């Protein structure tokens, strides 16, 4: 019952508040939990294993829809299972239509699944290092960069680029949770000549910014972004001034979902962050809304930097085909 | 008398043959002096006869070199001055709805007229003296610290603008040479002598460098009726790149470069010169079949222009229609 209590603790942590702060920690925890589910649970065929994984994935995704990394890991494990079963047993395209199965047992499938999960974890470990390594090809000397909020990938990007180049960074605090101050302090401690501003100044100073480098929470199927609130205005200003918008996002933040799906997209938190409880009687008559995430259309994004290199949003669909099976979108 | 005719012939021959005077300010001053001499050293009875004489002289001077719009601008300014003086000293405009809802002759010689006109012309000449300094004085309210300015060709007004701004602030200026007459090198070295930290490049790199440029400050040869520009070649591309990157485009141009004509005279708009500058005569037999065109001016639509800086201050391209309505009379456009 150790696995059951681990699953319950994970679900409760997802529901109440994020234990693993970094998304990489969440992905690693999900992968470890899925590995324990595969090993400990007793299954004969591949189909029953897939349906079990689907059940726990549905529970975990229902725990917190905004946290898409859990669902991404579940779907990656499902595609790994499908690929291994196909390899040990014997893609919607025009070629397939013109040219032209579970419930079979294979004893050695489990070891292949386990080793595939292990190599997936190994790849997961070094994503930020790869992004930082390729950072130096996009920053030139005496450049001006703009960042919104706090993202570890972007700060690693900038700190690796700062070892050989001198550039200016402008960080806009992400109100109400003003986490841009922490990133600005961290970058200033590395001597990167940073500046702190509020969101309201973004369009005021974008005319003097050479390029924008941002992180994200989720990349959708069409190349759209689920980012921190205020990123849509940032992208609109960048498009207005034609400054390139670079998104430093690893491959596990890539979700096969589409924008218009149940409208449970943004995450709404207590209005105490926006309007304090000490205002008084006016709070009876005032509707306060505090979204924490924002939708960014794919046409406002210039480039995607990931552990496999640089890509355009127009190619994102292909990265969907190589990662998730079309029958695992619904989960 | 005879000396006036000799001066007129010399002026028209200098206009139609080559350069002279060097600067547009000097050309405007010479045109105004010639017009003053015509007004004084000639006998006319009515104001209409003086207007007809000025019309004939201006027609000849503009036919000498249509690309030099400053001569026509001075002629039309003198005609407007004559109209204003006759109206003020005879009775007590601009074809508005107000005049249409509330409902001429230029005879009746009045003795006090002529002298008054001369005075007005002198006033005009006075504001020709401090025009460049007036434009340059307001450079410190458009340049901020560590800015990146970009310029095309050689412009004395822009040179004075930047040299006055550099006395109290540090900024970077990129000059794109205006091929074939690479006059941007002279402006670049002139700015470098003032320690403005200037960069030189060919004007094929305008779009590549526009991504790192904060403001574009350029001169012009003529401002058209709708706010359009007749500028050196490559200015239309520069404006297009600035509009693509939404970098503000500032035009530093005096008030005597305003021409009441519209861009529908496209045939004579550009000044086509010998193709020797583009393709040398030493190419050989291929010159027999190749068509080479070397325009020195091009048309910039008003929608690509952000601001107009002149000796009367800053303005938007949407207000140009008013300024010319205060400078020229509608019946004097055709001349």
JSON list of N, CA and C in Angstrom, two decimals, chain A residues 140 143 207-211 239-244, chain B residues 144 147 211-215 243-248:
[
{"chain": "A", "resi": 140, "resn": "UNK", "atom": "N", "xyz": [24.14, 38.79, -28.41]},
{"chain": "A", "resi": 140, "resn": "UNK", "atom": "CA", "xyz": [25.31, 39.52, -28.87]},
{"chain": "A", "resi": 140, "resn": "UNK", "atom": "C", "xyz": [25.68, 40.59, -27.85]},
{"chain": "A", "resi": 143, "resn": "UNK", "atom": "N", "xyz": [23.61, 43.96, -25.90]},
{"chain": "A", "resi": 143, "resn": "UNK", "atom": "CA", "xyz": [22.21, 43.76, -26.23]},
{"chain": "A", "resi": 143, "resn": "UNK", "atom": "C", "xyz": [21.33, 44.17, -25.04]},
{"chain": "A", "resi": 207, "resn": "UNK", "atom": "N", "xyz": [10.31, 49.86, -26.90]},
{"chain": "A", "resi": 207, "resn": "UNK", "atom": "CA", "xyz": [10.94, 50.51, -28.04]},
{"chain": "A", "resi": 207, "resn": "UNK", "atom": "C", "xyz": [12.45, 50.54, -27.93]},
{"chain": "A", "resi": 208, "resn": "UNK", "atom": "N", "xyz": [13.01, 50.30, -26.74]},
{"chain": "A", "resi": 208, "resn": "UNK", "atom": "CA", "xyz": [14.45, 50.30, -26.54]},
{"chain": "A", "resi": 208, "resn": "UNK", "atom": "C", "xyz": [14.99, 48.92, -26.21]},
{"chain": "A", "resi": 209, "resn": "UNK", "atom": "N", "xyz": [14.22, 47.86, -26.46]},
{"chain": "A", "resi": 209, "resn": "UNK", "atom": "CA", "xyz": [14.61, 46.49, -26.14]},
{"chain": "A", "resi": 209, "resn": "UNK", "atom": "C", "xyz": [14.88, 45.75, -27.45]},
{"chain": "A", "resi": 210, "resn": "UNK", "atom": "N", "xyz": [16.01, 45.05, -27.51]},
{"chain": "A", "resi": 210, "resn": "UNK", "atom": "CA", "xyz": [16.41, 44.38, -28.74]},
{"chain": "A", "resi": 210, "resn": "UNK", "atom": "C", "xyz": [15.65, 43.07, -28.95]},
{"chain": "A", "resi": 211, "resn": "UNK", "atom": "N", "xyz": [15.47, 42.29, -27.89]},
{"chain": "A", "resi": 211, "resn": "UNK", "atom": "CA", "xyz": [14.72, 41.04, -28.00]},
{"chain": "A", "resi": 211, "resn": "UNK", "atom": "C", "xyz": [14.18, 40.66, -26.63]},
{"chain": "A", "resi": 239, "resn": "UNK", "atom": "N", "xyz": [5.36, 42.28, -30.79]},
{"chain": "A", "resi": 239, "resn": "UNK", "atom": "CA", "xyz": [4.88, 42.24, -32.17]},
{"chain": "A", "resi": 239, "resn": "UNK", "atom": "C", "xyz": [4.71, 43.65, -32.73]},
{"chain": "A", "resi": 240, "resn": "UNK", "atom": "N", "xyz": [4.23, 44.58, -31.90]},
{"chain": "A", "resi": 240, "resn": "UNK", "atom": "CA", "xyz": [4.09, 45.97, -32.35]},
{"chain": "A", "resi": 240, "resn": "UNK", "atom": "C", "xyz": [5.44, 46.57, -32.73]},
{"chain": "A", "resi": 241, "resn": "UNK", "atom": "N", "xyz": [6.47, 46.30, -31.93]},
{"chain": "A", "resi": 241, "resn": "UNK", "atom": "CA", "xyz": [7.80, 46.81, -32.22]},
{"chain": "A", "resi": 241, "resn": "UNK", "atom": "C", "xyz": [8.66, 45.82, -33.00]},
{"chain": "A", "resi": 242, "resn": "UNK", "atom": "N", "xyz": [8.09, 44.68, -33.39]},
{"chain": "A", "resi": 242, "resn": "UNK", "atom": "CA", "xyz": [8.76, 43.67, -34.22]},
{"chain": "A", "resi": 242, "resn": "UNK", "atom": "C", "xyz": [10.02, 43.11, -33.57]},
{"chain": "A", "resi": 243, "resn": "UNK", "atom": "N", "xyz": [10.14, 43.22, -32.25]},
{"chain": "A", "resi": 243, "resn": "UNK", "atom": "CA", "xyz": [11.27, 42.59, -31.58]},
{"chain": "A", "resi": 243, "resn": "UNK", "atom": "C", "xyz": [11.04, 41.09, -31.48]},
{"chain": "A", "resi": 244, "resn": "UNK", "atom": "N", "xyz": [12.05, 40.27, -31.77]},
{"chain": "A", "resi": 244, "resn": "UNK", "atom": "CA", "xyz": [11.87, 38.82, -31.69]},
{"chain": "A", "resi": 244, "resn": "UNK", "atom": "C", "xyz": [11.51, 38.37, -30.28]},
{"chain": "B", "resi": 144, "resn": "UNK", "atom": "N", "xyz": [17.74, 61.33, -25.98]},
{"chain": "B", "resi": 144, "resn": "UNK", "atom": "CA", "xyz": [18.02, 60.93, -24.61]},
{"chain": "B", "resi": 144, "resn": "UNK", "atom": "C", "xyz": [19.38, 60.24, -24.54]},
{"chain": "B", "resi": 147, "resn": "UNK", "atom": "N", "xyz": [21.27, 57.00, -26.78]},
{"chain": "B", "resi": 147, "resn": "UNK", "atom": "CA", "xyz": [20.35, 56.67, -27.86]},
{"chain": "B", "resi": 147, "resn": "UNK", "atom": "C", "xyz": [21.11, 56.21, -29.09]},
{"chain": "B", "resi": 211, "resn": "UNK", "atom": "N", "xyz": [16.87, 46.95, -36.58]},
{"chain": "B", "resi": 211, "resn": "UNK", "atom": "CA", "xyz": [16.41, 46.27, -35.38]},
{"chain": "B", "resi": 211, "resn": "UNK", "atom": "C", "xyz": [17.07, 46.80, -34.11]},
{"chain": "B", "resi": 212, "resn": "UNK", "atom": "N", "xyz": [18.22, 47.47, -34.23]},
{"chain": "B", "resi": 212, "resn": "UNK", "atom": "CA", "xyz": [18.95, 48.00, -33.09]},
{"chain": "B", "resi": 212, "resn": "UNK", "atom": "C", "xyz": [18.95, 49.52, -33.05]},
{"chain": "B", "resi": 213, "resn": "UNK", "atom": "N", "xyz": [18.09, 50.17, -33.83]},
{"chain": "B", "resi": 213, "resn": "UNK", "atom": "CA", "xyz": [18.05, 51.62, -33.94]},
{"chain": "B", "resi": 213, "resn": "UNK", "atom": "C", "xyz": [16.83, 52.13, -33.17]},
{"chain": "B", "resi": 214, "resn": "UNK", "atom": "N", "xyz": [17.04, 53.14, -32.32]},
{"chain": "B", "resi": 214, "resn": "UNK", "atom": "CA", "xyz": [15.97, 53.69, -31.51]},
{"chain": "B", "resi": 214, "resn": "UNK", "atom": "C", "xyz": [15.19, 54.78, -32.24]},
{"chain": "B", "resi": 215, "resn": "UNK", "atom": "N", "xyz": [15.87, 55.63, -33.01]},
{"chain": "B", "resi": 215, "resn": "UNK", "atom": "CA", "xyz": [15.20, 56.72, -33.71]},
{"chain": "B", "resi": 215, "resn": "UNK", "atom": "C", "xyz": [15.90, 56.96, -35.05]},
{"chain": "B", "resi": 243, "resn": "UNK", "atom": "N", "xyz": [9.03, 51.84, -40.19]},
{"chain": "B", "resi": 243, "resn": "UNK", "atom": "CA", "xyz": [7.63, 51.50, -39.94]},
{"chain": "B", "resi": 243, "resn": "UNK", "atom": "C", "xyz": [7.49, 50.03, -39.57]},
{"chain": "B", "resi": 244, "resn": "UNK", "atom": "N", "xyz": [8.27, 49.16, -40.22]},
{"chain": "B", "resi": 244, "resn": "UNK", "atom": "CA", "xyz": [8.24, 47.74, -39.88]},
{"chain": "B", "resi": 244, "resn": "UNK", "atom": "C", "xyz": [8.66, 47.51, -38.44]},
{"chain": "B", "resi": 245, "resn": "UNK", "atom": "N", "xyz": [9.71, 48.21, -37.99]},
{"chain": "B", "resi": 245, "resn": "UNK", "atom": "CA", "xyz": [10.17, 48.08, -36.61]},
{"chain": "B", "resi": 245, "resn": "UNK", "atom": "C", "xyz": [9.55, 49.11, -35.68]},
{"chain": "B", "resi": 246, "resn": "UNK", "atom": "N", "xyz": [8.63, 49.94, -36.18]},
{"chain": "B", "resi": 246, "resn": "UNK", "atom": "CA", "xyz": [7.91, 50.93, -35.37]},
{"chain": "B", "resi": 246, "resn": "UNK", "atom": "C", "xyz": [8.85, 51.93, -34.70]},
{"chain": "B", "resi": 247, "resn": "UNK", "atom": "N", "xyz": [10.04, 52.11, -35.26]},
{"chain": "B", "resi": 247, "resn": "UNK", "atom": "CA", "xyz": [10.95, 53.13, -34.75]},
{"chain": "B", "resi": 247, "resn": "UNK", "atom": "C", "xyz": [10.51, 54.50, -35.26]},
{"chain": "B", "resi": 248, "resn": "UNK", "atom": "N", "xyz": [10.36, 55.49, -34.39]},
{"chain": "B", "resi": 248, "resn": "UNK", "atom": "CA", "xyz": [9.89, 56.81, -34.85]},
{"chain": "B", "resi": 248, "resn": "UNK", "atom": "C", "xyz": [10.85, 57.41, -35.87]}
]
